[PDB]
Design a protein around this ligand. Structure first.
Ligand SMILES: Nc1nc2c(ncn2[C@@H]2O[C@H](COP(=O)(O)OP(=O)(O)OP(=O)(O)O)[C@@H](O)[C@H]2O)c(=O)[nH]1
Ligand SMILES: Nc1nc2c(ncn2[C@@H]2O[C@H](COP(=O)(O)OP(=O)(O)O)[C@@H](O)[C@H]2O)c(=O)[nH]1
Ligand SMILES: [Mg+2]
Ligand SMILES: [Mg+2]
Lengths: 155, 491, 424, 423
């Protein structure tokens, strides 16, 4: 299966061998077991050129997996500021929700990616968005003693 | 991967242990010379002490399935094994902090304990570990000692007195040990000794010396115990323990001699060109001379002149009727003269009969097969096992299906001991299986379908695991037909 | 798949058998001395099939039949060794042919069969002609068939079996003999052409207007049918070329291999109609039940498979059209669940005495009518237990009759099942 | 660089003759093997005596057809060890081709293939020619393909199947044989060009102006279209230069590897423009498999022009069709039409009813409408297998009855695989 080799590459981060596999017509939106496209995997592990390569070949910027995770979720979780703005520029879902009720703003705030928090906010992130337990991004800064984030969330 | 069980990198050793654990599930009960993890038990003693917690645990579960693959005969070499193995198992398996590394080590000791005749040799080896630095080891191996007892118990123990003293000796110090667990788990070992011959004995020997609070808890523990002073039945039996007026035959009746019965006008009548001469000749000596009697004369009676003319017709005689009445004569001889057809008699009619299974007339196949069943029930598997295979390879479709059905018939009545290395096993894979597959893979379905039973009656005899090798080479589609009969078939 | 071994057994066997050899010897251009005086290669293209001199074995317990063949026209050509004949006759006793007297001789026959098969590049199968109401042709023939079936299981078995009818012999044991023989053929032969004397009389009497048909008159219809159905086998041609392929495209269920043959145009002994039929006329002798060699109405059942053989120079375009026509204009009579079940083939060399002809081999479920007639006569006879001491005396068991009776009725039921089957 | 051709059953063998007749005219090779005149040695090897021998094996379980090869116009061209024949044919029975008769000769055939592969240095793979409905063509091929996936597993294999058609059909059971081989040959084939004998019949009646075509008529037309596909491998073009590229360009799903081939122009021998012939590639009347691509989505599409062609005319004709027709593509496709050109003129046979044309084109397009062809077979199959008709023939020649169902499920699964791509 050529769609499975493109996932192996996009994850482990072999920029060149993506072009090889895609020149053989590999499925840009090929799903693994849990519904993760290569764009998911590259956006998780910080392979910026692989993200932009897949996106311009028609990667689903707002594709979800089995748990409702978009690539913007995973980029904002791990803290890949370069990729976050690439995804958003390609029409990413700033207020996407996943199965646990989190938005990308939740994940960037939990992991302390203050620089990504501000980018998401300026792309119209929902500061009052709640998760399953009922907590906003602002509640997380209150709960996690992060006054640097509380100020950045009310800006 | 064979010698890689001692390779430097851990993840290559981790393979060899999984490779081994497969080997001991998937290899032979009888056992390949490749299964030489008995006569060098230093190997697994090394593997159990692997310098890596993940590859260690995988060696123990390979030892575990090895150490239950060895509940097949003959492995009287379980004495050497307990010496070599349980000290590593106790010292560093029971010791382990890992949930699963420990659980399988105890299970291993269990299997070594029931390899033995009794519990003493295993007990005697793992006693010293009570005196070790690390508490969780003495915490644990007192729990392991206590459940080799509650499930087995003291039986077939030479000098129990010497053994009770040896395991009662540390119990004072263990019960005053610093560790909470070492103590708590020592009161359990006390109970399991009381549970078998307490409490008069333990109060004379050990209750006196413990803290008063302690002997109270032990008495409180004995009330909650219900059931007779020694347990009536053990929750687990040993090796030998688990397996643990003649009837009369009517054959004693006097013999009857039929040689005198025959008529002068017989030889030319059976060797005649007129079919009705032959039929009447055979039919007379059958209805007048054989059918009445119930036991022929064993002593000093040569029927191998009469039997070789029954064969001459059963094979070559063009009259299907004269065949039918002859094979019924042959059966009568084999039936009324049990224990005669050793070779000369049995063999004189055997290969002719197998040739004539070609006959498809129901009445005739009835008579030929039933006579083949006679020669078999008093000569099985002298000449038939080999020659039956020969005629499964024969060109006529009918003789294939019928001689294979014959092997099936015989195999259901295969009760010859033993217990191993019979004529069936000497030639099992080499010949029987190679020939049964030729039936299983025949061009005709009704032929193939006889093979499917004759393979499922085979597995039933000799283990659906032993033959899993040519099972794999077979179609997945034929496999589920074979299994169909395996589930229904009995011996 | 080249050579065919031919066998003829019993009186009828050697009669229609010799007649068949007369017909196809002419068609292939062989004289009674055994020499080629033809004038076309399409005649010797597949002469290796039936000839070497015929690859024919002649069998009868009745020794007289020997001479009735050799004193016939092409009687000189048959190999002297291939004559295998007994001392006495079977006398309409199937048991005598199958178990006692016929069984004594059957070995001698198999020796000759072996001899002729031994020197074959690649055998196709066998071809037996015989009557079913007799003792020898039925009893020894069916015993011969089984004996070959087991000695040559990698080969085809093809019979031309003729059914008894009161209209041709008033012997009442024939229902017994034919029932016992059908119980054999359904288990032992790949394909069987059902030649019905009932239908041969009804054709000679009603269509040919002969007030008293002789055997010769009935045998004329048979020999012409046989050359027709064997046209594919004897001349170059794409479709239904060898025995196995034919049976593969004719027999969808192993037991239902009893073909209802029929052909056109129906001529008398050496008459000429002075006007050759057209292609649509020939085609309209298919459902025409007055052309069936078996006394059955194709209208009363359904065709499972059909083979059409057009002989002569004619439009392959028109034949295709007419056959494609007659199928869909009678679509309810051809089974729907077997698509393209009718197959047509053309041979340019016409039959003797005709400019065009057409033979119509059909596996029609209507054939159950034929087996009904035989069974009712059998049962009427068997329920009063008449003449049973003949058969039982020769070693047969009364049970056999019940089994053959039941087995033929299962055969009738099977035909009735597939007739009432639906594709939906 | 070398490619080996294999011809199984009368269909393969007789289409083989037509193709190697046409290959030798296109390469100026003589019937005796000589040449008064590389890229073409992909298909031919060379003797020390200046003789050019095909890299081909002919197989039939019966002499008659291959006997005519080695007593005909091109008897000298082939080495006699390449022409293999049995004696008993498969009798329109996949079981006999695959199990009973095929096992008796498979080893001899595989051995003679090794002799041609041993002469080759960088072998690419195999071209395989065979009928569907034939017993040999279905059964033996599927067996041979299984065994080639072992003895040569790491290389390509391409099919040229003859899809059955009642107008020339010799057997009732041809649906059975088609399904049975397509099931067992599915995993072992990288790409497979189906040829509906009905379309080839229709084309020859309309454009060649023949009342009742013969096999020669159909085979010649077919050989022309086969030549158009293998032209890239024989003349070193730019597109489809080796066997892998067929899968790269046309196969975006291992299972769905059945391209529709369309060929224009078919001119009777009793010139058109570049634009006119490219429009005819999207006319169903000129397809090799009877279906309607308008009812389906394109997974890929290649255009193989050959002759007097200006590369700009092509781009105009492409833009015409890409704008003035609505060729629906799948969203996960490049959606760009791949092209290659070979400036040599289409060779016809001297005497042929097909005329020499100035330019010609062969469009290879993996459309989902070809599922219609599988549906027609599957339906005919279902009717007969509903009554277990003719099944005893197969089961009595070494075949398990289950294999019918396992094959039918694999065909039902393939019909679902075509559906999900096109929605
Ligand atoms: N287009 C084309 N079709 C053919 C040709 N020869 C046979 N066919 C078709 O192929 C199908 C099967 O026929 P064959 O290929 O001859 O059968 P086979 O492969 O020889 O197998 P067996 O004869 O059964 O042993 C039929 O439906 C024919 O219509 C041919 O030369 N050209
Ligand atoms: N068509 C035809 N039928 C015959 C001929 N001779 C006998 N029969 C039929 O065959 C049956 C008699 O069997 P027959 O062959 O004479 O006995 P056999 O010699 O023992 O096989 C009756 O049904 C007859 O009507 C013949 O020459 N032609
Ligand atoms: Mg007679
Ligand atoms: Mg063929």
């Amino acid at each position: 299966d050529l769609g499975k080799k493109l996932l192996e590459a996009a994850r482990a981060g072999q920029d060149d061998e993506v072009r090889i596999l895609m020149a053989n017509g590999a499925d840009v939106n090929a799903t693994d077991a849990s519904g993760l496209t290569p764009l998911h995997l590259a956006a998780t592990y910080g392979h910026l050129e692989i993200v932009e390569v897949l996106l311009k070949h028609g990667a689903d910027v707002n594709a979800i997996d089995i748990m409702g995770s978009t690539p913007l979720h995973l980029a904002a979780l791990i803290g890949h500021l370069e990729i976050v703005e690439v995804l958003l520029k390609h029409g990413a879902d700033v207020n996407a929700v996943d199965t646990w009720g989190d938005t990308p703003l939740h994940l960037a705030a939990i992991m302390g990616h203050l620089e990504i928090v501000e980018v998401l906010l300026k792309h119209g992130a929902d500061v009052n968005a709640q998760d399953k337990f009922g907590k906003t991004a602002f509640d997380i800064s209150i709960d996690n003693g992060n006054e640097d984030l509380a100020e950045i969330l009310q800006k | 991967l064979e010698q890689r069980a001692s390779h430097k990198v851990w993840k290559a050793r981790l393979n060899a242990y999984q490779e081994l654990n497969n080997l001991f599930t998937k290899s032979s009960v009888i056992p390949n010379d490749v299964a030489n993890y008995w006569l060098d038990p230093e190997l697994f003693a090394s593997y159990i002490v692997d310098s890596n917690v993940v590859a260690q645990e995988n060696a123990i579960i390979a030892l575990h399935t090895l150490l239950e693959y060895i509940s097949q005969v003959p492995n009287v070499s379980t004495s050497k094994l307990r010496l070599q193995w349980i000290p590593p198992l106790v010292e560093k398996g029971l010791s382990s902090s890992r949930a699963a590394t420990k659980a399988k080590a105890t299970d291993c000791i269990m299997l070594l304990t029931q390899s033995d005749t009794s519990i003493q040799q295993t007990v005697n080896l793992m006693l010293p570990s009570l005196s070790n630095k690390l508490p969780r080891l003495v915490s644990s191996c007192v729990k392991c000692l206590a459940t080799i007892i509650e499930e087995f118990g003291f039986i077939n123990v030479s000098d129990i007195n010497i053994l009770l003293s040896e395991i009662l000796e540390p119990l004072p110090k263990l019960s005053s040990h610093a560790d909470r667990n070492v103590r708590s788990e020592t009161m359990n070992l006390i109970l399991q000794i009381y549970k078998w011959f307490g409490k008069e004995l333990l109060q004379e020997l050990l209750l006196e010396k413990l803290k008063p609070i302690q002997q109270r808890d032990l008495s409180r523990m004995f009330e909650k115990y219900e059931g007779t002073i020694p347990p009536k039945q053990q929750p687990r039996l040993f090796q030998w323990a688990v397996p643990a007026n003649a009837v009369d035959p009517f054959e004693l009746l006097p013999p009857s001699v039929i040689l005198d019965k025959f008529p002068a006008d017989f030889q030319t009548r059976i060797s005649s060109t007129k079919w009705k001469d032959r039929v009447e000749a055979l039919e007379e000596i059958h209805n007048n001379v054989l059918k009445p009697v119930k036991k022929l004369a064993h002593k000093n009676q040569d029927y191998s002149d009469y039997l070789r003319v029954l064969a001459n017709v059963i094979q070559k005689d063009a009259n299907v009727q004269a065949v039918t009445i002859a094979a019924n004569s042959v059966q009568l001889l084999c039936n009324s003269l049990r224990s005669n057809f050793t070779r000369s008699y049995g063999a004189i009619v055997l290969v002719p009969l197998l040739e004539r299974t070609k006959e498809k007339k129901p009445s005739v196949n009835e008579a030929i097969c039933s006579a083949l069943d006679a020669v078999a029930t008093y000569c099985g598997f002298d000449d038939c096992l080999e020659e039956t295979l020969n005629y499964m390879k024969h060109k006529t479709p009918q003789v294939r299906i019928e001689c294979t059905k014959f092997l099936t018939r015989m195999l259901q009545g295969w009760k010859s001991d033993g217990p191993l290395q019979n004529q069936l096993l000497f030639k099992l894979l080499p010949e029987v299986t190679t020939a049964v597959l030729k039936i299983v893979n025949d061009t005709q379905p009704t032929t193939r379908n006889t093979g499917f039973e004759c393979f499922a009656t085979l597995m039933k005899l000799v283990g659906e695991r032993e033959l899993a090798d040519p099972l794999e080479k077979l179609d997945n589609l034929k496999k589920k037909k074979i299994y169909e009969y395996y589930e229904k078939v009995e011996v | 798949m080249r050579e065919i071994v031919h066998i003829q057994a019993g009186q009828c066997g050697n009669q229609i058998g010799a007649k068949f050899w007369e017909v196809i010897s002419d068609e292939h251009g062989i004289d009674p001395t055994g020499s080629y005086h033809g004038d076309s290669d399409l005649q010797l293209e597949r002469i290796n099939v039936y000839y070497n001199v015929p690859r024919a074995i002649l069998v009868d317990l009745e020794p007289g039949t020997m001479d009735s063949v050799r004193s016939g026209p092409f009687g000189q050509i048959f190999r002297p060794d291939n004559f295998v004949f007994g001392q006495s006759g079977a006398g309409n006793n199937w048991a005598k042919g199958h178990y006692t007297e016929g069984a004594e001789l059957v070995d001698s026959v198999l020796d000759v069969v072996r001899k002729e098969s031994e020197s074959c590049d690649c055998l196709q199968g066998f071809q037996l002609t015989h009557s079913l109401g007799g003792g020898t042709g039925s009893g020894m023939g069916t015993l011969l068939i089984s004996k070959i079936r087991e000695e040559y299981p990698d080969r085809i078995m093809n019979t031309f079996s003729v059914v008894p009818s009161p209209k041709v012999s008033d012997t009442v044991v024939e229902p017994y003999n034919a029932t016992l023989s059908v119980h054999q053929l359904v288990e032992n032969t790949d394909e069987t052409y059902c030649i019905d004397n009932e239908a041969l009389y009804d054709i000679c009497f009603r269509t040919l207007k002969l007030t008293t048909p002789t055997y010769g008159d009935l045998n004329h219809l048979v020999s012409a049918t046989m050359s027709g159905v064997t046209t594919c086998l004897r001349f170059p041609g794409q479709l239904n070329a060898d025995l196995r392929k034919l049976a593969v495209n004719m027999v969808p269920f192993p037991r239902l291999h009893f073909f209802m043959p029929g052909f056109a145009p129906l001529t008398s002994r050496g008459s000429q109609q002075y006007r050759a039929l057209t292609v649509p006329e020939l085609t309209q002798q298919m459902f025409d039940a007055k052309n069936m060699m078996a006394a059955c109405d194709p209208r009363h059942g359904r065709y499972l498979t059909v083979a059409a053989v057009f002989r002569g120079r004619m439009s392959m375009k028109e034949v295709d059209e007419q056959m494609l026509n007659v199928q869909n204009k009678n679509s309810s009579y051809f089974v729907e669940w077997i698509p393209n079940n009718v197959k047509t083939a053309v041979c340019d060399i016409p039959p003797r005495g005709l400019k065009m002809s057409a033979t119509f081999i059909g596996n029609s479920t209507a054939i159950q009518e034929l087996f009904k007639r035989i069974s009712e006569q059998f049962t009427a006879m068997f329920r009063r237990k008449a003449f049973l001491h003949w058969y039982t005396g020769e070693g047969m068991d009364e049970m056999e009759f019940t089994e053959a009776e039941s087995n033929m009725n299962d055969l009738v039921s099977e035909y009735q099942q597939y007739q009432d089957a639906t594709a939906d | 660089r070398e490619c080996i051709s294999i011809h199984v059953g009368q269909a393969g063998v007789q289409i083989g003759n037509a193709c190697w007749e046409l290959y030798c005219l296109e390469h100026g090779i003589q019937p005796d093997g000589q040449m008064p005149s590389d890229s073409f040695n992909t298909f031919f090897s060379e003797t020390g005596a200046g003789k050019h021998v095909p890299r081909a094996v002919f197989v039939d379980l019966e002499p008659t057809v291959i006997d005519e090869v080695r007593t005909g116009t091109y008897r000298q061209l082939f080495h006699p060890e390449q022409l293999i024949t049995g004696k008993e044919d498969a009798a329109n029975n996949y079981a006999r081709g695959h199990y009973t008769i095929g096992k008796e000769i498979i080893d001899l055939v595989l051995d003679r293939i090794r002799k041609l592969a041993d002469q080759c240095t960088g072998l690419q793979g195999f071209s395989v020619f065979h009928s569907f409905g034939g017993g040999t063509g279905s059964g033996f091929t599927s067996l041979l393909m299984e065994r080639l996936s072992v003895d040569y597993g790491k290389k390509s294999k391409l099919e040229f199947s003859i899809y059955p058609a009642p107008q020339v059909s010799t057997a009732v059971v041809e649906p059975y044989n088609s399904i049975l081989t397509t099931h067992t040959t599915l995993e072992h084939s990288d790409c497979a060009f189906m040829v509906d004998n009905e379309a080839i019949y229709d084309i020859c009646r309309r454009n060649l102006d023949i009342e009742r075509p013969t096999y020669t008529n159909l085979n010649r037309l077919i050989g022309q279209i086969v030549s158009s596909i293998t032209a890239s491998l024989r003349f070193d073009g730019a597109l489809n230069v080796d066997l892998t590229e067929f899968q790269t360009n046309l196969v975006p799903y291992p299972r769905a590897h059945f391209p529709l081939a369309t060929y224009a122009p078919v001119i009777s021998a009793e010139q058109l423009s570049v634009a006119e012939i490219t429009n005819a590639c999207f006319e169903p009347a000129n397809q090799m498999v009877k279906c309607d691509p308008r009812h389906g989505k394109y997974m890929a599409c290649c255009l193989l022009y050959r002759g007097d062609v200006v590369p700009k005319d092509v781009n105009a004709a492409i833009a015409t069709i890409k704008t003035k027709r609505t060729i629906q593509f799948v969203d996960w496709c490049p959606t760009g039409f791949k092209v290659g050109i070979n400036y040599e003129p289409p060779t016809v046979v001297p005497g042929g009813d097909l005329a020499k044309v100035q330019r010609a084109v062969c469009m290879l397009s993996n459309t989902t409408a070809i599922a219609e062809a599988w549906a027609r077979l599957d339906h005919k199959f279902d009717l007969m297998y509903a009554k277990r008709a003719f099944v005893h023939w197969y089961v009595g020649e070494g075949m398990e009855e289950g294999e019918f169902s396992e094959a039918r499920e694999d065909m039902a699964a393939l019909e679902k695989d075509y559906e999900e791509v096109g929605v």
